[PDB]
Design a protein around this ligand. Structure first.
Ligand SMILES: [Ca+2]
Ligand SMILES: [Ca+2]
Ligand SMILES: [Ca+2]
Ligand SMILES: [Ca+2]
Lengths: 417, 6
C-alpha cells in the first residue's frame, strides 16, 4: 500500500548548508534494523527547500555517486561534510496514496462549514435540543470538516462547539459526538491519557490503542500527547505500568516498527519463526524479551509470514502459544498485538462483537472503535464482521443500543452488512 | 532525538 520512486536531486550548498538533517546508519537506525540514511527535517529558506524535490522521510541512496548502504552514521555524515558545493543526491521517495478509501464516513461533497455551524447552533438553542439534526450533520461529515464546523461555530457564537454540546447532550450520545469532534491524534491521546490511573490503569484501553496504531499514527499521537498534556506519552506509560507489560507497551508506543521493504526476507522469516518457538513453546519458561523485540521490530507483512512459518515448527499457532506461555496483561497485550498484525479489521470486528455479545454493552470500547475507525477501515471491519458472525455490525449495534445514540453509531457504521 | 544538519 505504498509507492516508491527514485529521483536524482542536484543541490548547491549555499551559505547555510544544504538545509536538511539526516538520520540513520547501522548504529542509529531510523526504524528497527534499518540501516538506511533518511531525511528527518527540511529547513525553511534552505537549499533543499527552495529546490522542493527532496521531502522529509526520503531515503538517500547515494551522495556524489557514493552509496550510503550499510554505513556507520558518522561515515554518512562525513560524506556530506566533505562533499563539494555541488552535491548530487539519488533519493527514494515513499508515498501513501490511500486515505479513507475503506472508511465508512466520507467527505460531504456539498459541505458548507458556516451553514453547518448555523444549523447546529439553531439545533442547540431550540427548546429541548434538536439532537437529530446535530447527529445527522456531524456523523455525515469527515473529521476535518467537523474541525471547520467547530471553528466557524466559535467565530459566530464566541463559544466552543464542544462546550455547548457538553450542555446540550448527555449519556452515550455525548460521548460519541465529543469523540467525533476531536482530531484522530487528539482522540487517541485523550483516550490514552484517560486510561492512566496509577495502579488502576485501564490496561485494556492502552492495549487496544497502542497495539493497533501504526508508526505514522503513533508519531502524531506522541506529538499531540505532549502538546495537550505537557508530558511525553512514554513517560506516562512508564509511571503507569510495570514489568514485561511496560517494556512491550513502551516499545510499541515508540512507533518505530520497520516499514515493509520491497524484498521479502524469507531467511529472516524462518529465523524469526524458529526464535519465537525456541523462546517459548520449545523451552521451560519464556524468553519474553525475544518475543517483544521480534513482534515490535519487524514489519507487519513480514510478521504475517513469520506466524505462518511458525506453525511449521510449533504444534500450536502463535495465538494459542501465547495463551500457553504468559498470563495477565502481558498475555492480553500479546494476543491483541498478534491479532492486529494478522488481521486488523477482524481484530476490531471481534472487539465490537465482544463489546455487545453479552449482557449490557461495553459502550466505551464500542464508541471508541466506531469513532476512531470510521475513516480508516470500517468497511473492512464490516466485511469481516459479516463473514464471521453471519449478521451485520449494523444489526448488532441496533439490538444493543437505542435512541439517538443508536442513530449516531449506525451512521458511523455507514450501512447494513 | 535529532539527526545531523547537512
Ligand atoms: Ca430533544
Ligand atoms: Ca451533558
Ligand atoms: Ca515455554
Ligand atoms: Ca449486549
Amino acid at each position: 500500500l505504498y509507492l516508491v520512486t527514485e529521483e536524482e536531486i542536484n543541490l548547491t550548498r549555499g551559505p547555510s548548508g544544504l538545509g536538511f538533517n539526516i538520520v540513520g546508519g547501522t548504529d542509529q537506525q531510523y526504524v528497527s534494523n534499518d540501516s538506511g540514511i533518511y531525511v528527518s527535517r527540511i529547513k525553511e529558506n534552505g537549499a533543499a527547500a527552495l529546490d522542493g524535490r527532496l521531502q522529509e522521510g526520503d531515503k538517500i541512496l547515494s551522495v556524489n555517486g557514493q552509496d550510503l548502504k550499510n554505513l556507520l552514521h558518522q561515515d554518512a555524515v562525513d560524506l556530506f561534510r566533505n562533499a563539494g558545493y555541488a552535491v548530487s543526491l539519488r533519493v527514494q521517495h515513499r508515498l501513501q496514496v490511500q486515505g479513507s478509501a475503506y472508511g465508512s464516513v466520507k467527505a460531504y461533497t456539498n459541505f458548507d462549514a458556516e451553514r453547518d455551524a448555523l444549523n447546529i447552533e439553531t439545533a442547540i438553542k431550540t427548546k429541548g435540543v434538536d439532537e437529530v439534526t446535530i447527529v445527522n450533520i456531524l456523523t455525515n461529515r469527515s473529521n476535518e470538516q467537523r474541525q471547520d464546523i467547530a471553528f466557524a461555530y466559535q467565530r459566530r457564537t464566541k463559544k466552543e462547539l464542544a462546550s455547548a454540546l457538553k450542555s446540550a447532550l448527555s449519556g452515550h450520545l455525548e460521548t460519541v459526538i465529543l469523540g467525533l469532534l476531536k482530531t484522530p491524534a487528539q482522540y487517541d491521546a485523550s483516550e490514552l491519557k484517560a486510561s492512566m490511573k496509577g495502579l488502576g490503569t485501564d490496561e485494556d484501553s492502552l492495549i487496544e490503542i497502542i497495539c493497533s496504531r501504526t508508526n505514522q499514527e503513533l508519531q502524531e499521537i506522541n506529538r499531540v500527547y505532549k502538546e495537550m498534556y505537557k508530558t511525553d506519552l512514554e513517560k506516562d506509560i512508564i509511571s503507569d505500568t510495570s514489568g514485561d507489560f511496560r517494556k512491550l507497551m513502551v516499545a510499541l508506543a515508540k512507533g518505530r516498527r520497520a516499514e515493509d521493504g520491497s524484498v521479502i526476507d524469507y531467511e529472516l522469516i524462518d529465523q524469526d519463526a524458529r526464535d519465537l518457538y525456541d523462546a517459548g513453546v520449545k523451552r521451560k519458561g519464556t524468553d519474553v524479551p525475544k518475543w517483544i523485540s521480534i513482534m515490535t521490530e519487524r514489519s507487519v507483512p513480514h510478521l504475517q509470514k513469520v506466524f505462518d512459518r511458525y506453525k511449521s515448527y510449533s504444534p500450536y499457532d502463535m495465538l494459542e502459544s501465547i495463551r500457553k506461555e504468559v498470563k495477565g496483561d502481558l498475555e492480553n497485550a500479546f494476543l491483541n498485538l498478534v491479532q492486529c498484525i494478522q488481521n486488523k479489521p477482524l481484530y476490531f470486528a471481534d472487539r465490537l462483537y465482544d463489546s455487545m455479545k453479552g449482557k449490557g454493552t461495553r459502550d466505551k470500547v464500542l464508541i471508541r472503535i466506531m469513532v476512531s475507525r470510521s475513516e480508516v477501515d470500517m468497511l473492512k471491519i464490516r466485511s469481516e464482521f459479516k463473514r464471521k458472525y453471519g449478521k451485520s455490525l449494523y444489526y448488532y449495534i441496533q439490538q444493543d443500543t437505542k435512541g439517538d445514540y443508536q442513530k449516531a453509531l449506525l451512521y458511523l457504521c455507514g450501512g447494513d452488512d | 532525538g535529532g539527526g545531523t544538519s547537512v
